[PDB]
């Protein structure tokens, strides 16, 4: 059972930190991804082929070229960053409304919960404007990519829907 995961989100969201937390079991020092990172992570008898593409505004047009055959979307969000939460909403809805991301289940990592001023999942859900999305299988999972909190909870939901 191989599930193709596409992990997207704005820069500094913690995507690569999550990828290699799952892959290596440890949070590593990262570099702003301008290209892509791809790793296969196994969990509960499900080979997660996870794609991590960079979230800098300039290379976001490249996201679209990774849509084909994507069975799951992981949108990572920085919850301490309220300046770009609106920017995160627009991009999320730009991804999921694409022709080739129609059938994708959507896991949202409300990342960076360890930070004190971070927004809670019930605020992130609203601020990401997916409160009235009943059409799509989504779920917002609070997480801390550096500690690993919430990651395998999110994958458990992903597994149950695949």
């Amino acid at each position: 059972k191989e599930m193709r995961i596409l992990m997207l989100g704005l820069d500094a969201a913690g995507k690569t930190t999550i990828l290699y937390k799952l892959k290596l079991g440890q949070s590593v020092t990262t570099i702003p991804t301008v290209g892509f990172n791809v790793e296969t992570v196994t969990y509960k008898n499900v080979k997660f082929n996870v794609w991590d593409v960079g979230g800098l505004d300039k290379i976001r047009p490249l996201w679209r070229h990774y849509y084909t055959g994507t069975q799951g979307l992981i949108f990572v969000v920085d919850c301490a960053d309220r300046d770009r939460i609106d920017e995160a909403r627009q991009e999320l809805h730009r991804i999921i409304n694409d022709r080739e991301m129609r059938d994708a289940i959507i896991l949202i990592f409300a990342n960076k919960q360890d930070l004190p001023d971070a927004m809670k999942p019930h605020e992130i859900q609203e601020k990401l404007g997916l409160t009235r999305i009943r059409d799509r299988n989504w779920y917002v999972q609070p997480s801390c990519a550096t500690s690993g909190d919430g990651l395998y909870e999110g994958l458990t939901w992903l597994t149950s829907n695949y």
Binding site: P32, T33, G35, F36, V38, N49, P61, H65, Y66
Partner: protein, 185 residues
């Protein structure tokens, strides 16, 4: 489609495996000095005689003869170097199609990978010893075709925003770059 790109490089496969793939010059610069990588395709194509130390691209060739040419020109003096056979992925751009007329060195026919090339994308490697290339291809057991067989290089259209001409270059005044031109250009 599943065509391939070729890159001449003086780093042996064991070093490339430990690196995680063919990474850009700016990556090791970032972790050492904190210098943010330069994703301006124009700066990448220009260079400065060698590659820039903050460069965030990895150059490739379209053919084996061209990659060999890079090896016998740019890697001249090196006793041993490798020509890495690479699969196409959407972080790669055709330089001459992105920079158009203003491509600094069109004879390179360079296809540059933004952010470097993972190890799973490297099909294999030839070995060039003393200019001689008489050894057959060594297959990479780490290569993952399933990843890239259905992925092509990025269209020039997507690359225009990453051209990175100087703010006052005449290319930002013209098609098609004007559509991605930074304020004032």
């Amino acid at each position: 489609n599943d065509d391939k790109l070729y890159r001449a490089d003086s780093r042996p496969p064991d070093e490339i495996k430990q690196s995680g793939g063919l990474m850009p010059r700016g990556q090791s610069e970032y972790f050492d000095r904190g210098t943010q990588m330069n994703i301006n395709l124009y700066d990448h194509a220009r260079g400065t005689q060698f590659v820039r130390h903050d460069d965030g691209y990895v150059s490739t060739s379209i053919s084996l003869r061209s990659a060999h040419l890079v090896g016998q020109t740019i890697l001249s003096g090196h006793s041993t170097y490798y020509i890495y056979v690479i699969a196409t992925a959407p972080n790669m751009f055709n330089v001459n199609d992105v920079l158009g007329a203003y491509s600094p060195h069109p004879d390179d026919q360079d296809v540059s990978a933004l952010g470097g090339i993972p190890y799973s994308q490297i099909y294999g490697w030839y070995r060039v010893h003393f200019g001689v290339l008489d050894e057959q291809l060594h297959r990479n057991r780490g290569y993952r075709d399933r990843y890239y067989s259905n992925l092509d290089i990025a269209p020039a259209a997507d690359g225009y925003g990453l051209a990175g001409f100087p703010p006052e270059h005449r290319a930002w005044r013209e098609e098609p770059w004007i559509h991605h031109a930074p304020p004032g250009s």
